[PDB]
Amino acid sequence: TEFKAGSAKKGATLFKTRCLQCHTVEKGGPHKVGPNLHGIFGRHSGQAEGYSYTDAIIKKNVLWDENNMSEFLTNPKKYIPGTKMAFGGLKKEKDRNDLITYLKKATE
Numbered sequence: 413t414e415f416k417a418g419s420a421k422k423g424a425t426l427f428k429t430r431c432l433q434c435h436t437v438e439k440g441g442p443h444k445v446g447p448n449l450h451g452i453f454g455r456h457s458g459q460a461e462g463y464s465y466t467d468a469i470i471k472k473n474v475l476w477d478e479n480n481m482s483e484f485l486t487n488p489k490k491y492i493p494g495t496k497m498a499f500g501g502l503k504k505e506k507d508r509n510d511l512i513t514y515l516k517k518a519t520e
């Protein structure tokens with residue numbers, strides 16, 4: 413870890429305002445622009461069923477952990493050139509820590 417637990421409540425509202433437009437986090441939630449994130453931690457990328465991922469993200473084969481995730485959020489196209497994820501990134505560590513604390517709980 414190089415990822416410090418933040419505030420899950422602060423994390424939830426980041427999600428709502430920066431990620432809800434393309435993703436759901438609930439168990440049984442649907443895929444939208446972006447795939448559903450239920451159970452993404454400890455799972456490699458491009459593996460949710462019934463979702464058309466890029467070749468890019470598939471091949472990348474990232475194993476998603478709090479630390480991988482933090483780098484990805486920093487800058488998504490920079491981390492996985494080729495990705496269709498349209499997000500510029502979360503530059504502040506504090507914001508990323510919060511959001512990951514939230515994702516950690518919500519996708520379990």
Ligand code: HEM
Binds near residue numbers: 447497515
């Ligand atoms: C900071 C908020 C966000 C979070 C936590 C998030 C998280 C992620 C993660 C973890 C993946 C990879 C999924 C996998 O490997 O199963 C992903 C992929 C994706 N996200 Fe997001 N994302 C966010 C913002 C957005 C937004 C706002 C959009 C839509 C404008 C978006 C669109 C996508 C797309 C299209 C992909 C598929 C990538 C590809 O196939 O190349 N994401 N997202």
